[PDB]
Enzyme design. Structure first.
Site, PDB file in Angstrom:
ATOM      1  N   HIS A  75      25.867  32.931  41.269  1.00  0.00           N
ATOM      2  CA  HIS A  75      24.961  33.866  41.072  1.00  0.00           C
ATOM      3  C   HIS A  75      23.637  33.274  41.399  1.00  0.00           C
ATOM      4  O   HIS A  75      23.060  32.883  39.880  1.00  0.00           O
ATOM      5  CB  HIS A  75      25.736  34.603  39.566  1.00  0.00           C
ATOM      6  CG  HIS A  75      26.183  35.514  40.025  1.00  0.00           C
ATOM      7  ND1 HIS A  75      27.249  35.303  39.161  1.00  0.00           N
ATOM      8  CD2 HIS A  75      26.080  37.025  40.745  1.00  0.00           C
ATOM      9  CE1 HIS A  75      27.881  36.710  39.764  1.00  0.00           C
ATOM     10  NE2 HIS A  75      27.569  37.508  40.431  1.00  0.00           N
ATOM     11  N   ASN A  76      23.431  32.634  42.695  1.00  0.00           N
ATOM     12  CA  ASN A  76      21.958  31.578  43.033  1.00  0.00           C
ATOM     13  C   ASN A  76      21.250  32.609  44.155  1.00  0.00           C
ATOM     14  O   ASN A  76      21.608  33.587  44.179  1.00  0.00           O
ATOM     15  CB  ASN A  76      22.971  30.551  42.988  1.00  0.00           C
ATOM     16  CG  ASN A  76      23.899  30.522  44.001  1.00  0.00           C
ATOM     17  OD1 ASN A  76      23.339  31.098  44.799  1.00  0.00           O
ATOM     18  ND2 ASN A  76      24.535  30.050  44.271  1.00  0.00           N
ATOM     19  N   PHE A  77      20.481  31.660  44.062  1.00  0.00           N
ATOM     20  CA  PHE A  77      18.709  32.418  45.098  1.00  0.00           C
ATOM     21  C   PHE A  77      20.096  33.060  46.854  1.00  0.00           C
ATOM     22  O   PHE A  77      19.391  33.538  46.982  1.00  0.00           O
ATOM     23  CB  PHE A  77      18.514  31.132  45.083  1.00  0.00           C
ATOM     24  CG  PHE A  77      17.518  31.929  46.635  1.00  0.00           C
ATOM     25  CD1 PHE A  77      16.269  33.006  46.110  1.00  0.00           C
ATOM     26  CD2 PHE A  77      17.177  31.325  47.783  1.00  0.00           C
ATOM     27  CE1 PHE A  77      15.446  33.451  47.335  1.00  0.00           C
ATOM     28  CE2 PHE A  77      16.473  31.484  48.468  1.00  0.00           C
ATOM     29  CZ  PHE A  77      15.488  32.896  48.476  1.00  0.00           C
ATOM     30  N   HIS A  79      22.400  33.504  46.816  1.00  0.00           N
ATOM     31  CA  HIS A  79      23.372  34.841  46.551  1.00  0.00           C
ATOM     32  C   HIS A  79      22.851  36.084  47.572  1.00  0.00           C
ATOM     33  O   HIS A  79      23.089  36.851  48.045  1.00  0.00           O
ATOM     34  CB  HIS A  79      23.976  35.118  44.783  1.00  0.00           C
ATOM     35  CG  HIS A  79      24.588  36.450  45.257  1.00  0.00           C
ATOM     36  ND1 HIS A  79      25.932  36.823  45.265  1.00  0.00           N
ATOM     37  CD2 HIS A  79      24.301  37.281  44.225  1.00  0.00           C
ATOM     38  CE1 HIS A  79      26.006  38.188  45.100  1.00  0.00           C
ATOM     39  NE2 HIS A  79      25.161  38.738  44.585  1.00  0.00           N
ATOM     40  N   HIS A 115      18.567  42.284  42.519  1.00  0.00           N
ATOM     41  CA  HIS A 115      19.452  42.677  41.716  1.00  0.00           C
ATOM     42  C   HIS A 115      20.156  41.700  40.780  1.00  0.00           C
ATOM     43  O   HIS A 115      20.376  41.931  39.446  1.00  0.00           O
ATOM     44  CB  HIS A 115      20.511  43.211  42.464  1.00  0.00           C
ATOM     45  CG  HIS A 115      21.491  41.953  43.901  1.00  0.00           C
ATOM     46  ND1 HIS A 115      21.239  40.873  44.011  1.00  0.00           N
ATOM     47  CD2 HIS A 115      22.931  41.763  42.775  1.00  0.00           C
ATOM     48  CE1 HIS A 115      22.202  40.397  43.961  1.00  0.00           C
ATOM     49  NE2 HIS A 115      23.276  40.960  43.625  1.00  0.00           N
ATOM     50  N   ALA A 275      43.224  36.494  44.321  1.00  0.00           N
ATOM     51  CA  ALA A 275      42.199  36.938  43.142  1.00  0.00           C
ATOM     52  C   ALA A 275      41.742  37.903  45.000  1.00  0.00           C
ATOM     53  O   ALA A 275      41.285  39.237  44.245  1.00  0.00           O
ATOM     54  CB  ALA A 275      41.480  35.759  43.034  1.00  0.00           C
ATOM     55  N   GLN A 276      41.770  37.268  45.899  1.00  0.00           N
ATOM     56  CA  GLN A 276      40.604  38.121  46.876  1.00  0.00           C
ATOM     57  C   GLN A 276      42.022  39.152  47.890  1.00  0.00           C
ATOM     58  O   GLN A 276      41.567  40.340  48.116  1.00  0.00           O
ATOM     59  CB  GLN A 276      41.024  37.285  47.982  1.00  0.00           C
ATOM     60  CG  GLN A 276      39.688  36.039  47.852  1.00  0.00           C
ATOM     61  CD  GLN A 276      38.486  36.425  47.331  1.00  0.00           C
ATOM     62  OE1 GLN A 276      38.637  36.630  45.818  1.00  0.00           O
ATOM     63  NE2 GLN A 276      37.630  36.528  48.116  1.00  0.00           N
TER      64      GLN A 276
HETATM   65  C1  0WL Z   1      37.619  36.728  42.991  1.00  0.00           C
HETATM   66  C2  0WL Z   1      37.581  37.737  42.985  1.00  0.00           C
HETATM   67  C3  0WL Z   1      35.948  38.583  43.535  1.00  0.00           C
HETATM   68  N1  0WL Z   1      35.037  38.939  42.995  1.00  0.00           N
HETATM   69  C4  0WL Z   1      33.807  38.987  43.729  1.00  0.00           C
HETATM   70  C5  0WL Z   1      33.794  38.590  45.130  1.00  0.00           C
HETATM   71  C6  0WL Z   1      32.387  38.761  45.120  1.00  0.00           C
HETATM   72  N2  0WL Z   1      32.604  39.981  44.135  1.00  0.00           N
HETATM   73  N3  0WL Z   1      33.486  39.452  43.233  1.00  0.00           N
HETATM   74  C7  0WL Z   1      32.616  39.428  42.205  1.00  0.00           C
HETATM   75  C8  0WL Z   1      32.027  41.302  41.298  1.00  0.00           C
HETATM   76  C9  0WL Z   1      31.578  41.115  40.729  1.00  0.00           C
HETATM   77  C10 0WL Z   1      30.809  39.613  40.864  1.00  0.00           C
HETATM   78  C11 0WL Z   1      31.474  38.824  40.968  1.00  0.00           C
HETATM   79  C12 0WL Z   1      35.118  38.482  45.952  1.00  0.00           C
HETATM   80  O1  0WL Z   1      35.193  38.075  47.146  1.00  0.00           O
HETATM   81  N4  0WL Z   1      36.327  37.919  44.960  1.00  0.00           N
HETATM   82  N5  0WL Z   1      37.238  38.826  41.442  1.00  0.00           N
HETATM   83  C13 0WL Z   1      38.553  39.035  40.690  1.00  0.00           C
HETATM   84  C14 0WL Z   1      38.621  40.280  40.775  1.00  0.00           C
HETATM   85  C15 0WL Z   1      39.281  40.412  40.140  1.00  0.00           C
HETATM   86  N6  0WL Z   1      38.949  41.430  39.320  1.00  0.00           N
HETATM   87  C16 0WL Z   1      40.211  42.286  38.668  1.00  0.00           C
HETATM   88  C17 0WL Z   1      41.363  42.327  39.258  1.00  0.00           C
HETATM   89  C18 0WL Z   1      41.427  41.207  40.171  1.00  0.00           C
HETATM   90  N7  0WL Z   1      40.134  40.612  40.681  1.00  0.00           N
HETATM   91  C19 0WL Z   1      37.333  39.910  41.337  1.00  0.00           C
HETATM   92 MG    MG Z   2      24.623  41.412  39.405  1.00  0.00          MG
HETATM   93 ZN    ZN Z   3      24.949  39.932  42.923  1.00  0.00          ZN
END
Ligand code: 0WL
Ligand code: MG
Ligand code: ZN
EC number: 3.1.4.35
Length: 328
Positions: A75-77, A79, A115, A275-276
């Site tokens: 969460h940096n520039f 981004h 944002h 995760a992804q």
């Molecule tokens: C690693 C994966 C992820 N989050 C991401 C990506 C981009 N933005 N964000 C988040 C959105 C808000 C700020 C960061 C990305 O590519 N992957 N998180 C795990 C989370 C999750 N929650 C619940 C269940 C499964 N998975 C989703």
């Molecule tokens: Mg945000």
């Molecule tokens: Zn963001």
């Protein structure tokens, strides 16, 4: 093609060209070069022209936004440059200039850029459970986003940074309001609600209905914000390691401090591929799928990559699991 060499912060014609596409390699660039890109966007989109932005202010403003991002792992520039550049891509890929006013474009861009201002690298769940000053201050209501927003307008309040200094107060108020809606829309707590609103309007979408358009702008800023996996595999993949970095910082802290720990952030249980796979399958694809109903070229340029990514992480997952089974 060039007859002598230029400084980095004089973007070449090829960079300017590449910058219109989501294939752009966000990692190749240092902060100054990134700042020059964001600058060019504002000129290129006709926003400097149409809102009489004094061009030195545009720069000071950008420089100052940059100073107000932190060196978080994610969460940096950089981004924000991604989110802003994906919006830029989308203004071109969906010909948003045909559908939207320059006031709407200016909101989409300034909201994109701002944002995540002054993000502390720990989410609203941490703020709320740790009863941080921010959580107390904003009454557990989208604390971070409300904060980013406040920092946004505090910067714009400084006269040397005020890119809106030449907009009538009615327009200012209109821009301010859009910006607030959009930046708060980026709270993922509201994802299902916002997505449901949009889908309801999508039953009979109407470009002349303001409500419809506010929901579209919210989906657009949400798309750009979580859009990393739309980007080429070499560009997207390092982001995930960064986000996990922050995620782990928080769950360590949370364990040490005796606070609840998100299993999706738990070191011991998240792996990259798992995760992804879920995020792509159930958050990203569906969101861009409904965008594609309004803008069908979005499928080819953004669903396809997402499909490929889903499919690769599925492959990678098959291999982690084999190997993590030899740790036991
Ligand atoms: C690693 C994966 C992820 N989050 C991401 C990506 C981009 N933005 N964000 C988040 C959105 C808000 C700020 C960061 C990305 O590519 N992957 N998180 C795990 C989370 C999750 N929650 C619940 C269940 C499964 N998975 C989703
Ligand atoms: Mg945000
Ligand atoms: Zn963001």
């Amino acid at each position: 093609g060039s007859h002598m060499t230029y400084p980095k912060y004089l973007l070449s014609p090829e960079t300017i060209e590449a910058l219109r596409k989501p294939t752009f390699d966000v990692w190749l660039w240092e902060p100054n070069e990134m700042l020059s890109c964001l600058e060019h966007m504002y000129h290129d989109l006709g926003l400097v022209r149409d809102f009489s932005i004094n061009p030195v202010t545009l720069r000071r403003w950008l420089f100052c936004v940059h100073d107000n991002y932190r060196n978080n792992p994610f969460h940096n520039f950089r981004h924000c440059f991604c989110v802003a550049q994906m919006m830029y891509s989308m203004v071109w890929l969906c010909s948003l200039q045909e559908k939207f006013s320059q006031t709407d474009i200016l909101i989409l861009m300034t909201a994109a850029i701002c944002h995540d201002l002054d993000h502390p690298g720990y989410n609203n769940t941490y703020q709320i459970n740790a009863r941080t000053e921010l959580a107390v201050r904003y009454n557990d209501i989208s604390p971070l986003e409300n904060h980013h927003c406040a920092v946004a307008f505090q910067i714009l309040a400084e006269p040397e940074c005020n890119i809106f200094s030449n907009i009538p107060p009615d327009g200012f108020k209109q821009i301010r309001q859009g910006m607030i809606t959009l930046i708060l829309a980026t709270d993922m707590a509201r994802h299902a609600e916002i997505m449901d609103s949009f889908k309801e309007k999508m039953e009979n979408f109407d470009y002349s209905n303001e409500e419809h358009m506010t929901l579209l702008k919210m989906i657009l800023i949400k798309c750009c914000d979580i859009s990393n996996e739309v980007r080429p595999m070499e560009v997207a993949e390092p982001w995930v390691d960064c986000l996990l970095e922050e995620y782990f910082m928080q769950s360590d802290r949370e364990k040490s401090e005796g606070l609840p720990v998100a299993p999706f952030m738990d070191r011991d249980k998240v792996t990259k591929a798992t995760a992804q796979i879920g995020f792509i399958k159930f958050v990203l694809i569906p969101m861009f799928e409904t965008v594609t109903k309004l803008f069908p070229m979005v499928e080819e340029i953004m669903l396809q990559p997402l499909w490929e990514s889903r499919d690769r992480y599925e492959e990678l997952k098959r291999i982690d699991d084999a190997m993590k089974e030899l740790q036991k």
